[PDB]
Design an enzyme around this catalytic site. Structure first.
Site, PDB file in Angstrom:
ATOM      1  N   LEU A 145       0.913  -1.276  -0.219  1.00  0.00           N
ATOM      2  CA  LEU A 145       0.278  -0.283   0.111  1.00  0.00           C
ATOM      3  C   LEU A 145       0.639   1.549   0.158  1.00  0.00           C
ATOM      4  O   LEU A 145       0.210   2.305   0.074  1.00  0.00           O
ATOM      5  CB  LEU A 145      -1.030  -0.033   1.347  1.00  0.00           C
ATOM      6  CG  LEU A 145      -2.154  -1.301   1.187  1.00  0.00           C
ATOM      7  CD1 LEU A 145      -2.709  -1.096   2.090  1.00  0.00           C
ATOM      8  CD2 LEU A 145      -2.943  -0.614   0.236  1.00  0.00           C
ATOM      9  N   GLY A 146       2.144   1.398   0.549  1.00  0.00           N
ATOM     10  CA  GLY A 146       2.789   2.383   0.829  1.00  0.00           C
ATOM     11  C   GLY A 146       4.063   2.010   1.423  1.00  0.00           C
ATOM     12  O   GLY A 146       4.893   0.828   1.870  1.00  0.00           O
ATOM     13  N   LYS A 147       5.252   2.847   0.984  1.00  0.00           N
ATOM     14  CA  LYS A 147       6.033   2.979   2.235  1.00  0.00           C
ATOM     15  C   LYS A 147       6.860   4.113   2.530  1.00  0.00           C
ATOM     16  O   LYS A 147       6.362   5.588   1.904  1.00  0.00           O
ATOM     17  CB  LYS A 147       7.569   2.404   1.772  1.00  0.00           C
ATOM     18  CG  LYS A 147       7.708   2.895   0.184  1.00  0.00           C
ATOM     19  CD  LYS A 147       8.506   2.389  -0.862  1.00  0.00           C
ATOM     20  CE  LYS A 147       9.093   3.099  -2.197  1.00  0.00           C
ATOM     21  NZ  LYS A 147       8.363   3.614  -2.583  1.00  0.00           N
ATOM     22  N   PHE A 189      11.611   4.298   6.396  1.00  0.00           N
ATOM     23  CA  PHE A 189      12.228   2.604   7.259  1.00  0.00           C
ATOM     24  C   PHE A 189      11.203   1.970   6.896  1.00  0.00           C
ATOM     25  O   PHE A 189      11.575   0.584   7.162  1.00  0.00           O
ATOM     26  CB  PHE A 189      12.808   2.128   8.443  1.00  0.00           C
ATOM     27  CG  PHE A 189      14.502   3.377   8.170  1.00  0.00           C
ATOM     28  CD1 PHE A 189      14.698   4.440   8.513  1.00  0.00           C
ATOM     29  CD2 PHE A 189      15.192   2.853   7.827  1.00  0.00           C
ATOM     30  CE1 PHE A 189      16.368   5.716   8.420  1.00  0.00           C
ATOM     31  CE2 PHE A 189      16.408   3.402   7.212  1.00  0.00           C
ATOM     32  CZ  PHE A 189      16.905   4.043   7.960  1.00  0.00           C
ATOM     33  N   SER A 235       6.762  -0.353   6.021  1.00  0.00           N
ATOM     34  CA  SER A 235       6.266  -0.150   4.089  1.00  0.00           C
ATOM     35  C   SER A 235       4.643  -0.942   5.059  1.00  0.00           C
ATOM     36  O   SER A 235       4.573  -1.136   6.247  1.00  0.00           O
ATOM     37  CB  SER A 235       7.081  -1.442   3.757  1.00  0.00           C
ATOM     38  OG  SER A 235       6.683  -2.349   4.832  1.00  0.00           O
ATOM     39  N   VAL A 236       3.626   0.132   4.274  1.00  0.00           N
ATOM     40  CA  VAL A 236       2.170  -0.423   4.620  1.00  0.00           C
ATOM     41  C   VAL A 236       1.569  -1.710   3.944  1.00  0.00           C
ATOM     42  O   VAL A 236       1.940  -1.174   2.826  1.00  0.00           O
ATOM     43  CB  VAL A 236       1.112   0.364   4.796  1.00  0.00           C
ATOM     44  CG1 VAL A 236      -0.068  -0.114   5.800  1.00  0.00           C
ATOM     45  CG2 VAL A 236       1.613   1.557   6.277  1.00  0.00           C
ATOM     46  N   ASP A 271       5.219  15.087  10.283  1.00  0.00           N
ATOM     47  CA  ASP A 271       5.781  13.890   8.733  1.00  0.00           C
ATOM     48  C   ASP A 271       4.115  14.752   7.721  1.00  0.00           C
ATOM     49  O   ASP A 271       3.826  13.684   7.327  1.00  0.00           O
ATOM     50  CB  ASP A 271       5.982  13.357   8.043  1.00  0.00           C
ATOM     51  CG  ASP A 271       6.126  12.308   7.373  1.00  0.00           C
ATOM     52  OD1 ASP A 271       6.773  13.556   6.479  1.00  0.00           O
ATOM     53  OD2 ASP A 271       5.971  10.949   7.162  1.00  0.00           O
TER      54      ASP A 271
HETATM   55  C1  LIG Z   1      -1.799   6.746   3.434  1.00  0.00           C
HETATM   56  C2  LIG Z   1      -1.090   6.055   4.150  1.00  0.00           C
HETATM   57  C3  LIG Z   1       0.056   6.243   5.426  1.00  0.00           C
HETATM   58  C4  LIG Z   1       0.957   6.644   3.824  1.00  0.00           C
HETATM   59  N1  LIG Z   1       1.599   5.175   3.881  1.00  0.00           N
HETATM   60  C5  LIG Z   1       2.354   4.320   4.236  1.00  0.00           C
HETATM   61  O1  LIG Z   1       2.693   3.200   3.332  1.00  0.00           O
HETATM   62  C6  LIG Z   1       3.482   5.205   4.910  1.00  0.00           C
HETATM   63  C7  LIG Z   1       4.240   3.821   5.389  1.00  0.00           C
HETATM   64  N2  LIG Z   1       5.226   3.505   5.480  1.00  0.00           N
HETATM   65  C8  LIG Z   1       0.126   4.676   2.971  1.00  0.00           C
HETATM   66  C9  LIG Z   1      -0.870   4.438   3.965  1.00  0.00           C
HETATM   67  N3  LIG Z   1      -2.115   3.937   2.447  1.00  0.00           N
HETATM   68  C10 LIG Z   1      -2.237   3.840   1.356  1.00  0.00           C
HETATM   69  C11 LIG Z   1      -3.498   3.044   2.997  1.00  0.00           C
HETATM   70  N4  LIG Z   1      -4.617   2.739   1.907  1.00  0.00           N
HETATM   71  C12 LIG Z   1      -4.952   1.905   2.662  1.00  0.00           C
HETATM   72  N5  LIG Z   1      -5.228   1.560   4.571  1.00  0.00           N
HETATM   73  C13 LIG Z   1      -4.707   1.995   4.961  1.00  0.00           C
HETATM   74  N6  LIG Z   1      -4.603   1.764   6.397  1.00  0.00           N
HETATM   75  C14 LIG Z   1      -3.540   2.845   7.189  1.00  0.00           C
HETATM   76  C15 LIG Z   1      -2.845   3.145   5.886  1.00  0.00           C
HETATM   77  C16 LIG Z   1      -3.747   3.406   4.939  1.00  0.00           C
END
Ligand SMILES: C[C@@H]1CCN(C(=O)CC#N)C[C@@H]1N(C)c1ncnc2[nH]ccc12
EC number: 2.7.10.2
Length: 279
Positions: A14-16, A19, A21-22, A135
Site C-alpha cells: 500500500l505504501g512506504k 524505513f 512499509s504498509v 511529516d
Molecule cells: C496513506 C496511508 C499512510 C501512508 N502510507 C504508508 O504506507 C506509509 C508507510 N510506511 C500509505 C497508507 N495507505 C495507502 C493506506 N491505505 C489503506 N489503508 C490504510 N490503512 C492505514 C494506511 C493505509
C-alpha cells in the site's frame, strides 16, 4: 488486539516511508479468503534504532481515538516482547494524494474545505496529546469515503515532554524539504507550530489536487549553494508558493498565515478550524 502472524495473509503493497512499509493483508484465521482486510505496517528490515522508534509509534497510535486518525486495530509479535507489525483498519480509497489526482473533476472547493477541516481537527487533537507529527503531507492522509479523510501515518511523530514545547533532532531529516518550516531547515527544530507550517503546504496540495506540474517540489525548484540553503534563502526573503490556479482568495490568505516566518505568529490549529468551517 493481538494478531497471529500465521493468520496474516499477504496481498499487496500500500505504501512506504521512513524505513517502513504498509501492506494489504487479509486476517484470515479460517483460511478460506473470507477474513477481514487490514493494513499492516512493519519495518522493511531489522534495525535497533528503528525498532525503538517503531514501538514508540505503536504506542502513540494506540492512544489516539479520533474520527480523523486512522483506527489502530492491534499488533503482531515475534520474539517477546518484540512488536513485529502494527495492524490498522484498511480503507480502500487509499492515499489522499492519489484520490485527489483521480477524482479531480468530481470534487469541488467545498469538498476540499471539508477535507481541510477534518485534517485540521485531527491535528488539533494530535497537539492536545502533546504529539508533534513532523511529516504532515497529503501522502500521509487516507480517504475513508468521498466525504471523510483521516491522518494515517505516524512514522516520525514525537511526544513533547511536559516542560518543553519543541524537540530538536541531531541530524538533518530525510523527508522532502518542501514541507519543512524555516526553523526546521535552519535548526532542525520541530513543534506543533512547524506542523502548522506543513498544514499550509497540505492546503496547497489540496487546492492543486496534488497536481505534479505545480507540486511543492516542482514549483519551489522552479522558483529556486545547496538546495536546502536556496530554499531557506527563498523563504527568508518572504517568497512563498503561489496561490493555486482558481484558489479561493480566503484559502490562499490562510496558507500565507500558516507560513508566517516565525512559529509564534502562525495561527493555532484551534484557531484555523473555525475559519475553515466558516469557509
Ligand atoms: C496513506 C496511508 C499512510 C501512508 N502510507 C504508508 O504506507 C506509509 C508507510 N510506511 C500509505 C497508507 N495507505 C495507502 C493506506 N491505505 C489503506 N489503508 C490504510 N490503512 C492505514 C494506511 C493505509
Amino acid at each position: 488486539t493481538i494478531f497471529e502472524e500465521r493468520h496474516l495473509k499477504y496481498i499487496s503493497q500500500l505504501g512506504k516511508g521512513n524505513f517502513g512499509s504498509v501492506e494489504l493483508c487479509r486476517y484470515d484465521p479460517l483460511g478460506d479468503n473470507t477474513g477481514a482486510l487490514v493494513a499492516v505496517k512493519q519495518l522493511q528490515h531489522s534495525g535497533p534504532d528503528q525498532q525503538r522508534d517503531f514501538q514508540r509509534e505503536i504506542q502513540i497510535l494506540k492512544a489516539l481515538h479520533s474520527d480523523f486518525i486512522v483506527k489502530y486495530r492491534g499488533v503482531s509479535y515475534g520474539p517477546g516482547r518484540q512488536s513485529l507489525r502494527l495492524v490498522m483498519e484498511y480503507l480502500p480509497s487509499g492515499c489522499l494524494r492519489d484520490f485527489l489526482q483521480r477524482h479531480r473533476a468530481r470534487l469541488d472547493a467545498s469538498r476540499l474545505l471539508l477535507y481541510s477541516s477534518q485534517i485540521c481537527k485531527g491535528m488539533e487533537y494530535l497537539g492536545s496529546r502533546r504529539c508533534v507529527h513532523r511529516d504532515l503531507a497529503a501522502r500521509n492522509i487516507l480517504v475513508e469515503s468521498e466525504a471523510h479523510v483521516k491522518i494515517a501515518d505516524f512514522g516520525l511523530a514525537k511526544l513533547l515532554p511536559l516542560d518543553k514545547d519543541y524537540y530538536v533532532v541531531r541530524e538533518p531529516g530525510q523527508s522532502p524539504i518542501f514541507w519543512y518550516a524555516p526553523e526546521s531547515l535552519s535548526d532542525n527544530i520541530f513543534s506543533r507550530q512547524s506542523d502548522v507550517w506543513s498544514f499550509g503546504v497540505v492546503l496547497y496540495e489540496l487546492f492543486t489536487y496534488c497536481d505534479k506540474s505545480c507540486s511543492p517540489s516542482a514549483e519551489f525548484l522552479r522558483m529556486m549553494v545547496p538546495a536546502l540553503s536556496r530554499l531557506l534563502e527563498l523563504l527568508e526573503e518572504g517568497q512563498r508558493l503561489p496561490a493555486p490556479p482558481a484558489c479561493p482568495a480566503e484559502v490562499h490568505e490562510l496558507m500565507k498565515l500558516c507560513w508566517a516566518p516565525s512559529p509564534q505568529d502562525r495561527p493555532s490549529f484551534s484557531a484555523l478550524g473555525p475559519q475553515l468551517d466558516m469557509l
